[PDB]
């Protein structure tokens, strides 16, 4: 094609069936992989089109794109999708018939193989029965790209450490000609640096990292210990949030996250009695009550659901005007995911964490118990340190003064976000200072 972008748009349309890219960022990433002069790191949430960023460029390349993916279930999802698009995609694994195995190995030995995209477990990629095939592919210069999917699996500080992933670096170096595309949904900066080092990515690494920052979310922290009427404070909070078309009255809905079922039940009643209708949602309820509560919340019959973290996964509601954490979350990640259910329609929403040192001490305690249980059962691990530090970053978020968006950015590894008087601290630095000084005196 006269224009490389025109061929990319063409293939995205003709093969994959999309008129545009989901985001400028997915576009930029895909284009950097096509240009092929840089190793590429892509860190985008599950559903943000990571796959395409290597799958489309794989099709516009001379040769084969090997895609290392950690477990067979994940491979199969994409193989089947790619087969619906009549893409020449193969998978080498031991969940196969020994016949299919040799049919493919033969196809890979051909000068001009049928296979365009080869999905493979890291186990398979390091196994000696595959080494000959790998070598002839390397020798013939028949690899266009090496792709390492679920790249965080290389990090002991990530959530899913796989020793198998430690070997992928040696492999990467052998494929000098083929650029490496490493992808994950979840990487703190420390996991990023492990991905960059442990996979021997060639600097300069092009990074495409979906930021946390949403311009329409107002984050604040309130100290339960500093409030005479906590339930009253929450009620005013929910009402202000829902009362953003004064003429029409209550519009939108909200979520209030609590650690325990007991708390969900009681807090729902306390709010209802104080003039904001609310219902509890938690896994203790019968399946049918959950679907009635969710439904009532979804239909805006009851505007406020008070739930455990068991609520939100399977829900698309775009006019959540507020998420309030009544108890601090297990982790900054949790808090981000939960608070972030607010404001999906882009209109102003409010995320408020109700911090108490008592909650903090209780969650800190329960994290140290469940780590101990794991340390007894499957022995000591560096991920336990990351779990504790995951809580700590949220404790820190509550107990320090600074832009709240900035603190979430620091933790996930985003740039300083354009918080436009969009958090308590940026809107009134002194007010937050006062509350922290005041919380100091409480002990």
């Amino acid at each position, epitope marked *: 094609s006269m224009d490389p972008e025109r061929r990319v748009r063409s293939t995205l349309k003709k093969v994959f069936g999309f008129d545009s890219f989901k985001t400028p960022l997915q576009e930029s990433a895909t284009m950097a992989v096509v240009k092929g002069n840089k190793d590429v790191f892509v860190c985008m949430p599950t559903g943000a089109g990571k796959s395409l960023c290597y799958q489309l460029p794989a099709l516009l390349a001379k040769g084969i794109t090997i895609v290392v993916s950690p477990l067979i279930a994940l491979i199969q999802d994409q193989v089947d999708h790619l087969l619906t698009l009549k893409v020449r995609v193969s998978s080498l694994n031991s969940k196969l018939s020994a016949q299919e195995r040799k049919e493919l190995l033969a196809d890979l030995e051909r000068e001009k193989p049928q296979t365009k995209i080869l999905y493979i477990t890291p186990e398979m990629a390091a196994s000696s029965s595959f080494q000959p095939t790998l070598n002839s592919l390397v020798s013939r210069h028949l690899l266009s790209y090496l792709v390492v999917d679920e790249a965080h699996c290389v990090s002991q500080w990530g959530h899913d450490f796989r020793p198998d992933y430690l070997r992928l670096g040696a492999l990467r170096s052998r494929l000098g000609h083929a650029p490496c595309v490493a992808l994950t949904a979840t990487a703190t*900066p420390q996991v990023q*640096e492990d991905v*960059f080092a442990a996979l021997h990515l060639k600097k300069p690494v092009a*990074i495409f990292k979906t930021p946390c*920052f949403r311009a329409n979310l107002f984050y604040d922290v309130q100290f339960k210990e500093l409030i005479s009427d906590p339930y009253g404070n929450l009620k005013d909070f929910c009402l202000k949030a829902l009362g953003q078309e004064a003429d029409k009255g209550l519009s939108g809905c909200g979520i209030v996250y609590c650690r325990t079922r007991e708390a969900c039940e009681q807090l729902a009643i306390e709010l209802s009695c104080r003039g904001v209708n609310a219902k509890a949602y938690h896994a203790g309820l019968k399946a049918s009550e959950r679907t009635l509560v969710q439904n009532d919340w979804m239909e805006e019959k009851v505007p406020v659901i008070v739930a455990t973290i068991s609520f939100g996964m399977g829900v698309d509601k775009a006019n959540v005007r507020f998420v309030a954490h009544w108890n601090i979350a297990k982790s900054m990640a949790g808090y981000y995911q939960e608070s972030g259910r607010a404001g999906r329609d882009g209109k102003p929403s409010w995320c408020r964490l109700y911090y108490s040192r008592n909650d903090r001490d209780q969650v800190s305690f329960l994290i140290r118990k469940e780590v101990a249980k794991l340390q007894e059962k499957r022995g000591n691990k560096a991920s336990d340190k990351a779990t504790i530090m995951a809580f700590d970053a949220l404790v820190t978020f509550c107990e320090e003064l600074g832009c709240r968006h900035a603190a979430i950015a620091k933790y996930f*590894g985003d*740039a300083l976000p354009a918080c436009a008087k969009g958090c308590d601290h940026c809107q009134n630095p002194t007010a937050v200072r006062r509350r922290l000084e005041a919380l100091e005196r409480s002990s």
Partner: nanobody
Amino acid sequence: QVQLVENGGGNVQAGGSLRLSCAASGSIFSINRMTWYRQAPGKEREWVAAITSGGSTNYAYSVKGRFTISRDNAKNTVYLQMNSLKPEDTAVYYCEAYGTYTLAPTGEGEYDDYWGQGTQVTVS
């Protein structure tokens, strides 16, 4: 990309001190390691001192006890205090900002190594 500018070079009597600075500018989230190298003309480049983000420091055996590397992350700037200067310390001193993570609010960034032009240290 990143500008690494060195400062604080000079001509100084043996036994005297210098303080070199080294400031990275750009959309810097983090620097894995900042290392001071020195290069006398027609000699092999030499490792002087390093500091990780984390504040772990390491010195060449030749300068241990005489030089201190320090940093101000607020300014992505590392300092090399050089005391008891010897003529053997005469060289061009330069920085490596190794594992430099840059990032725009758009989510587009880089991981790369960056290098200073250097600063002249002569010890009579």
